[PDB]
Amino acid sequence: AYATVGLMMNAAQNRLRMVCRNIAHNGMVELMRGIYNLIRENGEVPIEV
Amino acid sequence: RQDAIDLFPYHNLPQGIDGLLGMSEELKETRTGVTKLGMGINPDVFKNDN
């Protein structure tokens, strides 16, 4: 995304970019999937059409 | 006297510790593709290094 100059090829930045990608796929997506089911299974919901 | 107290003669460190600690660093960084400062790959370059 910054191939202009900020080419990101630092093993330090990538051994960090790994940890956030873990938090995304082990954590955040399973919270969303968690909700979407929980909501999809109870109550009555409106939408401002 | 006046020569009655003097710092005990501790050894120096060795020149070799220094240099070999040196070599090992690079030997990791050539028998494996890891380098503490270098840029990583992407799918694109995995598919086209150009």
UniProtKB/TrEMBL annotation, chain B:
Highest taxon of source: Viruses
Protein name, as recorded: Portal protein
Classification lineage: Viruses, Duplodnaviria, Heunggongvirae, Uroviricota, Caudoviricetes
